[PDB]
Structure formats: structure tokens, C-alpha cells
């Protein structure tokens, strides 16, 4: 998901489910291997404490101007037609050039 070799397209993205395992998010927040690492419905430092049953990850590539469309409530060519999120989106978004 994170250290993958190649990503998919925004037209068709792969959905990797995670369950029943140990997830150490300390490296993802500390390591500066991404240009943007923000969260909306949870703190990035508290992903280990208030943890979850099911976790889904969608990997795709988009243009620089389209990174802003990957956020709750946005509209655009990617937000409305390719990849939309709900107003109650409880997740995190990552971006890297």
C-alpha cells in the first residue's frame, strides 16, 4: 500500500483491505517519504490508540492540481467523476510527487 512499487490509475484503483494484524503508523508519520500526510477524521499521532476493525486503502495516481480534489466535499473532474468521498469521510489522505 505505502511502499508499493507501482500504483493504479484514478479511473480504476485497487482496494486493499487490512484486518487482523499489527499496524505501526509511527514510521508513516515520522518518515518524510511523502509530500503531504494529513488526516480528517482522526489525529495522525493517535492512529495506534483509537484503532479500528476494518481498514481500506485506495492507491491511485493523479496530477498535482487534482490533489486538492482528494478531500471531503470537493468538486471537480476527479472529485465528481473519478473518485468521490462523502461529507462524513473518516480517513486520511497522502500525496507524494
Amino acid at each position: 500500500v505505502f511502499n508499493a512499487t507501482r500504483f493504479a490509475s484514478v479511473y480504476a484503483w485497487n482496494r486493499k483491505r487490512i484486518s487482523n494484524c499489527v499496524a505501526d503508523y509511527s514510521v508513516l508519520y515520522n518518515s518524510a517519504s511523502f509530500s503531504t500526510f494529513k488526516c480528517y477524521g482522526v489525529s495522525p499521532t493517535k492512529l495506534n490508540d483509537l484503532c479500528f476493525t476494518n481498514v481500506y486503502a485506495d492507491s491511485f495516481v493523479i496530477r498535482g492540481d487534482e490533489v486538492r480534489q482528494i478531500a471531503p466535499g470537493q468538486t471537480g473532474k476527479i472529485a465528481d467523476y473519478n473518485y468521490k468521498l462523502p461529507d462524513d469521510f473518516t480517513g486520511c489522505v497522502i500525496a507524494w510527487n
Binding site: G41, V42, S43, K46, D49, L50
Partner: protein, 49 residues
């Protein structure tokens, strides 16, 4: 109108810059629910009096 009715759902989940906004909604709602209770009981006491 908040994310969740529980405090621990917000305190340890969101950061203080955003948790204070969500926490303020519960405090604004739960406090009005007290004034509605105290006001009613304070009127019922008159009929009892």
C-alpha cells in the same frame, strides 16, 4: 451535529484545534437540555407549592 456523542471519541481521536469545536457543540447542547429540565421542575414546584 458533532462527530460522536462520546467525549473519548473526540478527545483522543481529533486534535485540540478541531476537538474544541466538536466538544463545544456537545457542551452547547447538553447545557440547554439542563435549562429545559431545571425550568420545568422549577415550574412544577409552584403547582406543588
Amino acid at each position: 451535529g458533532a462527530i460522536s456523542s462520546v467525549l473519548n471519541d473526540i478527545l483522543s481521536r481529533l486534535d485540540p484545534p478541531e476537538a474544541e469545536v466538536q466538544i463545544d457543540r456537545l457542551i452547547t447542547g447538553r447545557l440547554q437540555s439542563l435549562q429545559t429540565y431545571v425550568t420545568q421542575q422549577l415550574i412544577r414546584a409552584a403547582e406543588i407549592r
